[PDB]
Design a protein around this nucleic acid. Structure first.
Length: 571
DNA sequence: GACTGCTTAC
DNA sequence: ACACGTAAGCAGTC
């Protein structure tokens, strides 16, 4: 039997002086078995003997400290699992999944302690896990800036906070492991849950392995959310308005859209219609013009002519090279005039609906019928599945080492390649989401202000008639009226403020309407702006210019990581 | 269009 | 071996 522990560090804040001042571990399966202490050597002496699986929330962070120690106490990075070495899975993007510390072997069997990221299983802050999973959480936090020299003694209150953090996550992990969700990541749990229901044998045949060449081509057609500000509202304080968003955008598409499967057939030129293979990805080159009355939908990245975040009113005298799904292209043909179109090549796929039916209604049932923890875990299964079909088969890692200056650096290791899952499915799921949002926006063209992925922001407070049929606050894939606002200011993409109408229901501040409301609530959405800076935003100062030197930046230094204060400015 | 290394929005 | 993202954005290095 292999033991699991929930762990945490607290650490100092000086660049010149970065160390652990307290540590905690708790047996996930026996919360009475735990220890708080003030020494890394002591923690790490234990790490090297428990021969168990450890979890930290945000392994990226405690990890820098762990590897700084390992490197100064006789360990080296090795992918081959030798004695006195450590292996890691750290992605190209600097996301941390594992630290495997090998001590040796008894017979064939490895003797080691593996450290994981509980954030990868439970992707929220600890405070929120507590609230949502109905677990005990203390209000407030440890005083972060506070002088703590070597041999600082942990106070009773800090012991309290440290014990509570590790317990919140112990209790949560355990509920998850008990539910069957034992894999490394929330995403791995979903996909395994989905494979379980359709069976591995069928999965392999319905979702075959494409070559790296084809996968890369399918991937040129893989895009995310539609994020668009109607430019007539740009940097202009408006009055009343309202926000609708879809109920579970992605699962909604998975439940009922025509989605691709099986071994694709490659074609040259322009796709020719085929009932048996009715979905396709088409490579074209063309010019185009937005028609009057229509929202733009063509966004061109990775070219020296745009400006990859703009949705374009026109191709501006240049030939646009793009790989598109048939959903993209059908929308695009209806919003634009496309001309001088060169149809190069493409793949076509067979298709069906309800490949995800059994999965989705299983966990939706579990969601509708359960409270707190299990309810959350059921949301987690539903929402973590689709992202995972389009997994990049390039798993080239990052390898840690100590730079000559005592701090932790990173080099890219060898090219590694895993088998492609089923990237076309990812292409179409997100294609359908976009179509859903854009056609709703366009139906409300005379009122639209903004969209971001699953949201449409409209002027005025009455529900528009074209939308009235597909609006319901609960039904999957329908639009829910989630808020109404008194006034708003949209600066650019992912950058807006709203004064939301709220009201008191059971003494709680919950969204209301303009013939209801008891109160207003200021709300700041602004990518890259950390919550402390948001408090400084007001309606008057929220504009290109706004700048505050209050932004934490984590920097590598000898010993570990330290948050340093940086500036955030709207440019 | 292509640095690194990080943030939030969804 | 084990490993969901895309998108839009700021600041500092060389």
């Amino acid at each position: 039997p292999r033991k699991m522990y929930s762990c945490a560090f607290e650490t100092t804040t000086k660049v010149e002086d970065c160390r652990v001042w307290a540590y905690g571990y708790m047996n996930i399966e026996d919360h009475s078995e735990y220890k708080i202490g003030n020494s890394l050597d002591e923690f790490m002496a234990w790490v090297l003997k428990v021969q168990a699986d450890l979890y930290f929330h945000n392994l990226k962070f405690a990890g820098a400290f762990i590897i700084n120690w390992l490197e100064r106490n006789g360990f080296k990075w090795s992918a081959d699992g030798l004695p006195n070495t450590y292996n890691t899975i750290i992605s190209r993007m600097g996301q941390w999944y594992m630290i495997d510390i090998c001590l040796g072997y008894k017979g064939k069997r490895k003797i080691h302690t593996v450290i994981y990221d509980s954030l990868k299983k439970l992707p929220f802050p600890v405070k929120k896990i507590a609230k949502d999973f109905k677990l005990t959480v203390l209000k407030g936090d440890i005083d972060y800036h506070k002088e703590r020299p070597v041999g600082y003694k942990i106070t009773p209150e800090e012991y309290a906070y440290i014990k509570n953090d590790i317990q919140i996550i112990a209790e949560a992990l355990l509920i998850q492991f008990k539910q069957g969700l034992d894999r490394m990541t929330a995403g791995s749990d979903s996909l395994k849950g989905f494979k379980d229901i359709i069976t591995t044998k069928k999965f392999k045949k319905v979702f075959p392995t494409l070559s790296l060449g084809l996968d890369k081509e399918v991937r040129y057609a893989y895009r995310g959310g539609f994020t668009w500000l109607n430019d007539r509202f740009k940097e202009k304080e408006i009055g009343e308005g309202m926000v609708f968003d879809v109920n579970s955008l992605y699962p909604a598409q998975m439940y009922s859209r025509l989605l691709p499967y099986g071994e694709p057939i490659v074609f040259e030129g322009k796709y020719v219609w085929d009932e048996d293979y009715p979905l396709h990805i088409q490579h074209i080159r063309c010019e185009f013009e937005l028609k009057e009355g229509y929202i733009p939908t063509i966004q061109i990245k990775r070219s020296r002519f745009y400006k990859g975040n703009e949705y374009l009113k026109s191709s501006g005298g240049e030939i646009a090279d793009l790989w598109l799904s048939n959903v993209d292209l059908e929308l695009m043909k209806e919003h634009y005039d496309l001309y001088n179109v060169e149809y190069i090549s493409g793949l076509k796929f067979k298709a069906t609906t309800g490949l995800f039916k059994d999965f989705i209604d299983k966990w939706t049932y579990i969601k509708t019928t359960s409270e707190g923890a299990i309810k959350q875990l059921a949301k987690l299964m539903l929402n973590s599945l689709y992202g995972k079909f389009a997994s990049n088969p390039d798993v080239t890692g990052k390898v840690p080492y100590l730079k000559e200056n005592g701090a932790l650096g990173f080099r890219l290791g060898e090219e590694e390649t895993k088998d492609p899952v089923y990237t076309p499915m990812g292409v179409f799921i997100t294609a359908w989401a976009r179509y859903t949002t854009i056609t709703a926006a366009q139906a409300c063209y005379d009122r639209i202000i903004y969209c971001d992925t699953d949201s449409i922001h409209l002027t005025g407070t009455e529900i528009p008639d074209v939308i009235k049929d597909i609006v319901d606050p609960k039904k999957l894939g329908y639009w829910a009226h989630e808020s109404t606002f008194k006034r708003a200011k949209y600066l650019r993409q992912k950058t807006y403020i709203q004064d939301i109408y709220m009201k008191e229901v059971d003494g709680k501040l919950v969204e209301g309407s303009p013939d209801d409301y008891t109160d207003i609530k200021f709300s700041v959405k602004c990518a890259g702006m950390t919550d402390k800076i948001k408090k400084e935003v007001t309606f008057e100062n929220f504009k290109v210019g706004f700048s505050r030197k209050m932004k934490p930046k984590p920097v590598q230094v000898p010993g570990g990581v330290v948050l340093v204060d940086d500036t955030f400015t709207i440019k």
